[PDB]
């Protein structure tokens, strides 16, 4: 490589350490790498950013796909890539996102330990639906939707805005659609919609609807049938075409679940089966993926026209009682 070109680039290259203060501000460590709550050293910007050093070196398939997609996606309810820093000496990649103080895992947990207000649940569901509709319209599947990935913005100019995160760019099964558990070989839009149905139930009751003790997972299916009932042939005609259909027939009898229904489960948790909430939830939690509602159809549901209307800020101008993210050690 030409020497003049090399030094000019090394002179002018923005380095993550020079632009951002993140010493001792680690908020996450996982398989993804390390994430910090960072502020600009320059001072002109006052906002916090989420600063991720990706795990490993170089540019893996998953890193490449994540950078490639996040570089194109632009929507209020999907968390957006602000900048990429490439550190050449060590071949480490840093991604800068907008910082979300909260998420549904921590919010639901705060209420499970004081009911989760029903205006907030509607507003959360709508913004989740809006974000996934945008992704689905661009043929981008999430592939692992759950409360941990549904981030919510804290105080600032995007207060109470849902931000979808951690799309599948390239254990617990509580949010997995029954076709996945019966051996379906491909992720679909419908699989994301089932997961959204599970989250909505959990937001209404504070309990994961298909909670189960830790492709074919018998106990997870048992919990879906204890909640939903066992599907009649008429409800899911192509269930016979699922790879694990005979295993299902071997292990399960429909007789076992004859007193089970979504209506009975939700009634136990003080959600009326005549409510628009419930009718929407039942459309999202349809066992047959081809009979499941789409994100667009769900957004048009009359649930969202019923008092109270959804709000842009899911906290509705009220005080945020949820605690800020804990700092972690560098160990």
């Amino acid at each position: 490589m030409d020497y003049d070109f090399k030094v000019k680039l090394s002179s002018e290259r923005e380095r993550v350490e020079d632009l951002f203060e993140y010493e001792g501000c680690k908020v996450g460590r996982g398989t993804y790498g390390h994430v910090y709550k960072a502020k600009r050293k320059d001072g002109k910007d006052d906002k916090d950013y989420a600063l991720k050093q990706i795990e490993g070196t170089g540019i893996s398939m998953s890193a490449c796909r994540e950078i490639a997609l996040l570089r194109e996606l632009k929507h209020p309810n999907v968390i957006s890539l602000q900048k990429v820093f490439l550190s050449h000496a060590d071949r480490k990649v840093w991604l800068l996102f907008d910082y979300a103080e909260h998420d549904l895992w921590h919010i639901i947990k705060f209420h499970r330990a004081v009911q989760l207000p029903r205006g907030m649940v509607k507003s959360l569901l709508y913004q989740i639906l809006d974000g996934i509709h945008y992704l689905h319209a661009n043929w981008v599947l999430h592939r692992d939707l759950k409360p941990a990935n549904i981030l919510v913005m804290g105080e600032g100019p995007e207060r109470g805005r849902v931000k979808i995160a951690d799309m599948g760019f390239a254990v617990t099964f509580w949010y997995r659609a029954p076709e996945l558990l019966l051996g379906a070989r491909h992720y679909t839009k419908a699989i994301d919609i089932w997961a959204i149905g599970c989250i909505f139930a959990e937001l209404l009751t504070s309990e994961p609807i298909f909670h189960c003790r830790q492709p074919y997972h018998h106990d997870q299916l048992d919990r879906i049938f204890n909640v939903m009932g066992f599907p009649a042939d008429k409800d899911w005609e192509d269930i016979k075409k699922m790879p694990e259909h005979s295993t299902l027939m071997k292990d399960f009898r429909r007789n076992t679940y004859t007193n089970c229904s979504l209506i009975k489960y939700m009634e136990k948790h003080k959600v009326k089966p005549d409510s628009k909430a419930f009718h929407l939830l039942q459309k999202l939690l349809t066992m047959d993926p081809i009979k499941r509602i789409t994100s667009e159809q769900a957004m048009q549901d009359p649930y969202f026209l019923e008092d109270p209307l959804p709000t842009s800020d899911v906290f509705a101008g009220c005080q945020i009682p949820y605690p800020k993210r804990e700092f972690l050690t560098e160990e």
Partner: protein
């Protein structure tokens, strides 16, 4: 088919459709060493190296096209002496292969493809073996991704060409030739200057004239700037005259020796 209808909000459109004057302004540094003629001949040559690398690696045409767009973007901005284009060609194919969901082409398979393609199919240009190893590809990848500002998703004319020929009801008659003509457009700067759908309309038009198919009414019924389409047809007709008059195999050793060389360290 990720991001397939997002072109008008895409990084390709908003950042990587360049003005022709800026392109030819940045190119003047390399035009001290090479003539205009020799520069377009280099572009043809390195397009063919990249096609041969993809063919050897059994990659789909879309992945080859994306790799070719990367290579062109780099040298639209920087001189040919910045990084050896012999290094850059396989780097672009490696990076494009990771984007397009085929695979992280094996390190040993990327290098073997590079070595064998230059020995077997380009010995007239390259008498010495491919001198680079995987650590050189890996360094280059970081430079390439930085210059492209991490813009990895590239739109091509293939998809809209297929939609247009289906609307005509002339897939079997016109598609093969229109498709090969879209492949040929990558020998030129077009992919940096016009949106892909306009390139597909130009290639389809040239295919209709070559095969003597009257499509005047269909083209009349489109809501498009035909002055822009005629500019593209004019470049497509020019490239076949350039093709006729160019012997890559006789000329390329001499042209490559005239390329500006990198400065070493002090």
């Amino acid at each position: 088919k990720a991001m397939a209808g997002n072109f008008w909000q895409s990084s390709h459109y908003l950042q990587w459709i360049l003005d022709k004057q800026d392109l030819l302004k940045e190119r003047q540094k390399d035009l001290k060493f090479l003539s205009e003629e020799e520069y377009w001949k280099l572009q043809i040559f390195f397009t063919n190296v990249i096609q041969a690398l993809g063919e050897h690696l059994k990659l789909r045409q879309q992945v080859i096209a994306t790799a070719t767009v990367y290579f062109k973007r780099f040298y639209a901005r920087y001189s040919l002496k910045s990084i050896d284009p012999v290094l850059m060609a396989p780097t672009c194919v490696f990076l494009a292969s990771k984007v397009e969901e085929f695979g992280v082409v094996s390190n040993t398979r990327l290098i073997a493809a590079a070595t064998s393609v230059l020995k077997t199919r380009f010995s007239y240009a390259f008498p010495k073996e491919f001198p680079y190893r995987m650590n050189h590809i890996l360094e280059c990848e970081f430079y390439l991704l930085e210059l492209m500002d991490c813009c990895l998703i590239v739109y091509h004319p293939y998809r809209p060409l297929l939609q247009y020929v289906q609307d005509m009801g002339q897939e079997d008659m016109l598609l093969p030739l229109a498709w090969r003509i879209v492949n040929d457009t990558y020998r030129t700067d077009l992919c940096l200057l016009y949106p892909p759908f306009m390139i597909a309309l130009a290639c389809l038009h040239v295919a209709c004239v070559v095969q003597q198919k009257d499509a005047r009414q269909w083209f009349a019924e489109l809501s498009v700037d035909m002055e822009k389409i005629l500019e593209i047809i004019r470049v497509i007709l020019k490239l076949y005259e350039q093709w006729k008059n160019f012997d890559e195999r006789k000329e390329m050793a001499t042209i490559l020796s005239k390329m500006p060389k990198p400065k070493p360290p002090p």
